[PDB]
Amino acid sequence: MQLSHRPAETGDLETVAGFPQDRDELFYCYPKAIWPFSVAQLAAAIAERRGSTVAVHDGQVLGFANFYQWQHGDFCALGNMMVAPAARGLGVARYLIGVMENLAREQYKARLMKISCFNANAAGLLLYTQLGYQPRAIAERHDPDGRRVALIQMDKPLEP
Ligand SMILES: [Cl-]
Ligand SMILES: [Cl-]
Ligand SMILES: [Cl-]
Numbered sequence: 001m002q003l004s005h006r007p008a009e010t011g012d013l014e015t016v017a018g019f020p021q022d023r024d025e026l027f028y029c030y031p032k033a034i035w036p037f038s039v040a041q042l043a044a045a046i047a048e049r050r051g052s053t054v055a056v057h058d059g060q061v062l063g064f065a066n067f068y069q070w071q072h073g074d075f076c077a078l079g080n081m082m083v084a085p086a087a088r089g090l091g092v093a094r095y096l097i098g099v100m101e102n103l104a105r106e107q108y109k110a111r112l113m114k115i116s117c118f119n120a121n122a123a124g125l126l127l128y129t130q131l132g133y134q135p136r137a138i139a140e141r142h143d144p145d146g147r148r149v150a151l152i153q154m155d156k157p158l159e160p
């Protein structure tokens, strides 16, 4: 997995917007989105966020991430994290988290990275644990069917 990264570009939107495969995945990816996902919804998210980045392998955009919160000298929080179905389990999310941690450190002088993960996302919970994130709190959210879900709020220190 040769991976590279760069800021997201308008030409990447269609591909990235195709990453969520069903309403639940979209909810995890982007809770305020409405199924079906679209390039316009993705572009609106990008405009409201910071650090929108794609991961590329063999000429293909395989992952997307950004920050939904950023506080200089303090912390950043992972926003959207989306990975192409064919590329899941291959280190794309791991790679992107590392890139976002560096950008938190460098651009925002962050001491902490926050990651929230919905309870159904076992693969996320397990990966973030492997990367040294620790659970701090559990919040209640509601899914698109109005069912109660648990949001596991995790964090990790970042040094200078
Ligand atoms: Cl930015
Ligand atoms: Cl795919
Ligand atoms: Cl991964």
Ligand SMILES: [Cl-]
Residues within 6 Å of the ligand: 028, 029, 116, 117, 118, 121, 124
């Ligand atoms: Cl999640």
